[PDB]
Curated annotation (Swiss-Prot), chain A:
Family to which the UniProt record says this protein belongs: Belongs to the WD repeat WDR24 family.
Parent-protein start and end of this portion: 340 to 452 of 790
Subunit organization: Component of the GATOR2 subcomplex, composed of MIOS, SEC13, SEH1L, WDR24 and WDR59. The GATOR2 complex interacts with CASTOR1 and CASTOR2; the interaction is negatively regulated by arginine. The GATOR2 complex interacts with SESN1, SESN2 and SESN3; the interaction is negatively regulated by amino acids. SESN1, SESN2 and SESN3 convey leucine availability via direct interaction with SEH1L and WDR24.
Stated role: Catalytic component of the GATOR2 complex, a multiprotein complex that acts as an activator of the amino acid-sensing branch of the mTORC1 signaling pathway. The GATOR2 complex indirectly activates mTORC1 through the inhibition of the GATOR1 subcomplex. GATOR2 probably acts as an E3 ubiquitin-protein ligase toward GATOR1. In the presence of abundant amino acids, the GATOR2 complex mediates ubiquitination of the NPRL2 core component of the GATOR1 complex, leading to GATOR1 inactivation. In the absence of amino acids, GATOR2 is inhibited, activating the GATOR1 complex.
Protein's name according to its UniProt entry: GATOR2 complex protein WDR24
Cellular localization per UniProt: Lysosome membrane
Substitution effect: M75E: Abolished interaction with WDR59 and assembly of the GATOR2 complex
Domain of life: Eukaryota
Coiled coil segments of this chain: none
PTM: Autoubiquitinated; MIOS is required to prevent autoubiquitination.
Curated annotation (Swiss-Prot), chain B:
UniProt note on regulation of activity: The GATOR2 complex is negatively regulated by the upstream amino acid sensors CASTOR1 and SESN2, which sequester the GATOR2 complex in absence of amino acids. In the presence of abundant amino acids, GATOR2 is released from CASTOR1 and SESN2 and activated.
Name the UniProt record assigns to this protein: Nucleoporin SEH1
Chief site of localization: nucleus
Gene designation: SEH1L
Keywords noted in UniProt: Cell cycle, Cell division, Centromere, Chromosome, Chromosome partition, Isopeptide bond, Kinetochore, Lysosome, Membrane, Mitosis, mRNA transport, Nuclear pore complex, Nucleus, Phosphoprotein, Protein transport, Repeat, Translocation, Transport, Ubl conjugation, WD repeat
Organism listed in the record: Homo sapiens (Human)
GO annotation terms (biological process): attachment of mitotic spindle microtubules to kinetochore; cell division; cellular response to amino acid starvation; cellular response to nutrient levels; defense response to Gram-positive bacterium; mitotic metaphase chromosome alignment; mRNA transport; negative regulation of TORC1 signaling
GO cellular component: cytosol; GATOR2 complex; kinetochore; lysosomal membrane; nuclear envelope; nuclear pore; nuclear pore outer ring; Seh1-associated complex
Pfam family, one: WD40
GO molecular function: structural molecule activity
Database matches in PROSITE patterns: WD_REPEATS_2, WD_REPEATS_REGION
UniProtKB/Swiss-Prot annotation, chain C:
Portion held of the full protein: 651 to 756 of 974
Superkingdom field: Eukaryota
Family assignment from sequence similarity: Belongs to the WD repeat WDR59 family.
Function: As a component of the GATOR2 complex, functions as an activator of the amino acid-sensing branch of the mTORC1 signaling pathway. The GATOR2 complex indirectly activates mTORC1 through the inhibition of the GATOR1 subcomplex. GATOR2 probably acts as an E3 ubiquitin-protein ligase toward GATOR1. In the presence of abundant amino acids, the GATOR2 complex mediates ubiquitination of the NPRL2 core component of the GATOR1 complex, leading to GATOR1 inactivation. In the absence of amino acids, GATOR2 is inhibited, activating the GATOR1 complex.
Entry's localization field: Lysosome membrane
Protein name per UniProt: GATOR2 complex protein WDR59
The protein's assembly and partners: Component of the GATOR2 subcomplex, composed of MIOS, SEC13, SEH1L, WDR24 and WDR59. The GATOR2 complex interacts with CASTOR1 and CASTOR2; the interaction is negatively regulated by arginine. The GATOR2 complex interacts with SESN1, SESN2 and SESN3; the interaction is negatively regulated by amino acids. Interacts with DDB1-CUL4A/B E3 ligase complexes.
Ranges for the WD repeats: 18-56
Reported impact of L48E: Abolished interaction with WDR24 and assembly of the GATOR2 complex
Positions of transmembrane segments: none
């Protein structure tokens, strides 16, 4: 009776017949990875020395909210 | 906490599958009244129907999208013992391309191969035959050839490919049975492609599963070295298929067994990255599960 | 005087500091002492200690919230590699300090 699917934005589509929620079914999208985009945009990969690149990436990681990621750059 | 925004499908019968395409902005719904509908996203923030037609002469069970590289392509299987491929031509013109008519009883599942080895398509059959198609000319979608065929000696009810994109995992497929036989014969099987014999061969069989299977789903790899499989027989189960160093031999292990549903589990799905797993039982609720760096899976949400 | 052969130096021993109130405070001072003593190995390991103990990566309560820093290949494995290196070098001056700092961090 049912069907499920995910999405790139964490949206869940659920359809099930109106005998468990009998000749029709109802569905809804549940608006349940934002850091990925900003991490991709703000990073630096060339055009600077190694130390400057690591420092910039560490600053970006720290500003985004993940510190365990930020300290790895500084350690490197 | 998700917000459940409902949309009116206006389908004249049940709904059997929903699928997002590649970008999360279009979905396709298959129903039991021989219709396939397409919904697109607006900047306002709501889904509106942009295409609908009459597909088959039976009951459409599944609809799946293809990779955007090959175009906007859809596939569908039905109770009229066929399988079709459609393309959108620019307004909303959806045109039929082929009709895979080789089956004899019915077609239960249809899935596109991962888009790193061509435009390949695998269809199941209630008689127990899994057939793999191919299109050597990527751009003519009217020329499909039959490359392999597998007989599993049991009713077939599900299918799922291996998305692992590395040059260390020979492509493999998983099929699930639904036979309510009195004997406790295994109902999930795995086949893998051998490079030198140009033939699919049985790799391993999940003996511990002796209950009817309703859904099979692999987990996206994204850099792991082993594989993860989810089965929804009567409780959600997660397996592990770590190989041995150099068919191939896998050491299967059981990682989860969740009877939280107190009913029969119908369908499952994986998030985008093999971190969260969804489920759907007869109680009418969706449930999400996740790991905790000790490989101790636990619930992480209940949605009605 | 055979102090040229020993693995431990008294001059470094005089200038050390160990404050439980502020762990991060003591490591920079020890790094400066190592810099003014003539050992670049100590400056590197004390720099790693500074960047390895910041309060932002303190452990949490529920294991499901996030993986602890200790399981990272830089917390408990870098430390355990340096400890083994210094034991092989047989230097009980850096061993005691590193153990004390990382333990008092708890």
């Amino acid at each position: 009776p049912e069907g499920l699917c995910y999405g790139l934005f964490g949206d869940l589509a659920f359809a099930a017949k109106e005998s468990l929620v009998l000749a029709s079914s109802a569905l809804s999208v549940f608006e349940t990875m934002r850091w990925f985009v900003d991490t991709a945009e703000r990073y630096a990969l060339a055009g600077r020395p190694l130390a400057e690149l690591c420092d910039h990436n560490a600053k970006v990681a720290r500003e985004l909210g993940r510190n365990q990621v930020a300290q790895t750059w500084t350690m490197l | 906490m998700f917000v459940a925004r409902s949309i009116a499908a206006d389908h004249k019968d049940l709904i059997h599958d929903v699928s997002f395409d590649f970008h999360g902005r279009r979905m396709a719904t298959c129903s039991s009244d021989q219709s396939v509908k397409v919904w697109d996203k607006s900047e306002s923030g709501d889904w509106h129907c942009t295409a609908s037609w009459k597909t088959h002469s039976g009951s459409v069970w599944r609809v799946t999208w293809a990779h955007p590289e090959f175009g906007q392509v859809l596939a569908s299987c039905s109770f009229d013992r066929t399988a079709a491929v459609w393309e959108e031509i620019v307004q909303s013109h959806w045109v039929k391309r082929t009709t895979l008519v080789d089956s004899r009883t019915s077609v239960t599942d249809v899935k596109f191969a991962p888009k790193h080895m061509g435009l390949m398509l695998a269809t199941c059959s209630a008689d127990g035959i899994v057939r793999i198609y191919e299109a050597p000319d990527v751009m003519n979608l009217s020329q499909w050839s039959l490359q392999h065929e597998i007989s599993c000696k049991l009713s077939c009810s599900c299918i799922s490919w291996n998305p692992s994109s590395s040059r260390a995992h020979s492509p493999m497929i998983a099929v699930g049975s639904d036979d309510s036989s009195p004997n406790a014969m295994a109902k999930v099987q795995i086949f893998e492609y051998n490079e030198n014999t140009r033939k699919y061969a049985k790799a391993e069989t999940l003996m511990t599963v002796t209950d009817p299977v309703h859904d099979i789903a692999f987990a996206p790899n994204l850099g792991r070295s082993f594989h993860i499989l989810a089965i929804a027989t009567k409780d959600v189960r997660i397996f592990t298929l770590k190989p041995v160093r150099k068919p191939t031999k896998f050491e299967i292990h059981i990682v989860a067994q969740f009877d939280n549903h107190n009913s029969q589990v119908w369908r499952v799905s994986w998030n985008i990255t093999g971190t969260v797993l969804a489920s759907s039982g007869d109680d009418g609720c969706v449930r999400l599960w996740k790991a905790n760096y000790m490989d101790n899976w636990k619930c992480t949400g209940i949605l009605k | 005087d055979i102090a040229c052969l020993l693995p431990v130096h008294k001059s470094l021993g005089e200038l050390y500091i160990l404050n439980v109130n502020d762990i991060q405070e003591t490591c920079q001072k020890n790094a400066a002492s190592a810099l003014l003593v003539g050992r670049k190995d100590l400056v590197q390991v004390w720099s790693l200690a500074t960047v390895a103990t910041d309060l932002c990566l303190g452990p949490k309560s529920d294991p499901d919230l996030e993986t602890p820093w200790a399981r990272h290949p830089f917390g408990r494995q870098l430390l355990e590699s340096l400890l083994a290196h210094y034991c092989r070098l047989r230097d009980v001056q850096t061993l005691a300090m590193l153990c004390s700092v990382f333990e008092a961090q708890s």
